[PDB]
Amino acid sequence: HVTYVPSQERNFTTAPAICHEGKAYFPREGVFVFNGTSWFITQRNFFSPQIITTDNTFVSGNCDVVIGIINNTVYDPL
Amino acid sequence: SISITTEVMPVSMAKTSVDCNMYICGDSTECANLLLQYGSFCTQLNRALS
Amino acid sequence: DDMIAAYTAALVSGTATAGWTFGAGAALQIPFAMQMAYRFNGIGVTQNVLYENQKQIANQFNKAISQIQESLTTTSTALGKLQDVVNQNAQALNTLVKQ
Ligand SMILES: *[C@@H]1O[C@H](CO)[C@@H](O)[C@H](O)[C@H]1NC(C)=O
Ligand SMILES: *[C@@H]1O[C@H](CO)[C@@H](O)[C@H](O)[C@H]1NC(C)=O
Numbered sequence A: 001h002v003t004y005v006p007s008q009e010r011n012f013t014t015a016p017a018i019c020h021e022g023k024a025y026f027p028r029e030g031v032f033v034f035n036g037t038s039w040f041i042t043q044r045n046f047f048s049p050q051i052i053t054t055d056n057t058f059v060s061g062n063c064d065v066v067i068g069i070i071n072n073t074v075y076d077p078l
Numbered sequence B: 001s002i003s004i005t006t007e008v009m010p011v012s013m014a015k016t017s018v019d020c021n022m023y024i025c026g027d028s029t030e031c032a033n034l035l036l037q038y039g040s041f042c043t044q045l046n047r048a049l050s
Numbered sequence C: 001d002d003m004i005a006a007y008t009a010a011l012v013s014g015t016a017t018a019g020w021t022f023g024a025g026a027a028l029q030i031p032f033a034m035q036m037a038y039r040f041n042g043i044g045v046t047q048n049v050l051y052e053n054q055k056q057i058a059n060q061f062n063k064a065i066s067q068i069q070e071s072l073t074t075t076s077t078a079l080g081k082l083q084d085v086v087n088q089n090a091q092a093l094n095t096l097v098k099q
Helices: B020-024 B029-049 C002-017 C032-042 C047-052 C054-073 C080-098
Strands: A013-015 A024-027 A031-034 A039-042 A057-059
Touching (some): C032 C047
Antiparallel strands (some): A024 A057, A031 A039
């Protein structure tokens, strides 16, 4: 059996969602991570930081019901 | 294409019971008296079958 | 029995702290709400459903645990196929003695 074994763990600061002009942004797949400078979105099994855009996330509700939500910005390409 | 394949499987078999007294000593009183001290073996067989 | 209890305690602690990753390899820490969000996402429900109804889901979890606790304090036959093993072993040895 040929299998894939992940290794070389690293700690990041994480959040469930980000608030941006009164809306809650949840990731499509992946997690929001903070590495000391800015917030990125990444896959769970490999570390590959990506810019939080409108394509990565989706909107559901306003930011006063989710526990642990933070303020940040979402880059719209247009 | 859309295909349909059949697969057959057994689920149960026949439930059976035996009566030691008639199999070993059929309608004989002397044989039943001699068999009277083998009763643990027959209750063991009946428990297995049930 | 203490060794088996220690094994089950280790399994429950690893599930509550690391999640699903300690079976594939080294354990990865993750807060429990995010693990619940991934489990919700795995069955086809978006994670905002978890993150907006967290109080209700937590209360239902606690209520279900209490019902499991109350069911096992009343005399019943829930563990009746574990009793059959010890009954069969004892009956076989006593049959050998009586034969
Ligand atoms: C965090 O990630 C960004 C990605 O470009 C990088 O520029 C920055 O140096 C990283 N910060 C630390 C502390 O590693
Ligand atoms: C930033 O977050 C804090 C606490 O979550 C909140 O009180 C504040 O209103 C947020 N900023 C804006 C501009 O809404």
